[model samples]
Target: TPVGLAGFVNKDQIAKDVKQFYDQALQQAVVDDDANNAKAVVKTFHETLNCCGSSTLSALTTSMLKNNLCPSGSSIISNLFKEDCHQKIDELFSGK
Candidate 1:
């Protein structure tokens, strides 16, 4: 049940989805050594281009992904989080 979007879902089902997503991510992370290296490279990039403060980082992240914004010098995929997924993030923050 969604109580102002703050209530819980079926934990087992949600946990399954989380597990599946992370499993896929882990599999892909190992597909190439360069992919793992890129994660570190991006963290270094974040040290520079992540201008917005950490407190507002969640909203900034959603807005960037929703708008498909990427760092000018970065190669990260713009769809790291999809637009529809960002809509769900709004509810998470707003308690909608």
Candidate 2:
């Protein structure tokens, strides 16, 4: 289990919550079809989830792209940040 910060007492639960949020957030981004909104969402996750950095942001975007969340050739989210989000996530959980 992970350790929590501030008002959050369960890091593991926080992780789960954040993962759900990520899924929903990605879905919303896909539905909205707005690169600007996608960028803002990525930034929000990066800042809110301290463990997620540039690489993670990139990975998340890539995941969305792979899942056909955002349209290809016109994905602002993918164009904005391209990195290995999966590896970063694995590294994070492994360390924990």
Candidate 3:
């Protein structure tokens, strides 16, 4: 669960969903050989589930960002997914 956002969200369910998405991203990152695909997922994790000053999410993102999978200046490429990670999570949380 995120620090500041706890009161605004369903902690338990969010935790479950976060794990689900993290695993999903990890799988795709390995399969596609492109960590950029996981960028949106990590981005959402930051926006919705992060704490300032210290975030374990840093490890999750930095490792991928440093890998060849997601090199710098690669955001120019369009993602295959119609919805981004943030959108996907928002939809899930909103029960859409």
Q: Is candidate 1 or candidate 2 better by lDDT?
A: 2
Rank candidates by TM-score, best first: 2, 3, 1
Clashing pairs in 2: 59-85
TM-score of every prediction relative to native:
0.28, 0.38, 0.32
Computed on alpha carbons, the lDDT of every model, listed in order, comes to 0.38, 0.48, 0.45
RMSD of each: 12.3, 9.2, 11.8
- For all candidates, what are the clash counts? 1, 1, 0
**What would the TM-score be for candidate 2 when compared with the true structure?**
0.38
User: Deviation in angstroms for 87 in model 2?
Assistant: 7.0
Model 3 per-residue lDDT at 52: 13
Top of the candidates by TM-score: 2
- TM-score of model 1 vs. true structure: 0.28
Q: Could you give me the TM-score of model 3 versus the true structure?
A: 0.32
State the lDDT of candidate 2 residue by residue for 55-92, as single tens digits. Answer: 33445555554444443344454445443333334445
RMSD of 1: 12.3
Poorly placed runs, candidate 2 (over 4 Å): 1-8, 33-39, 43-96
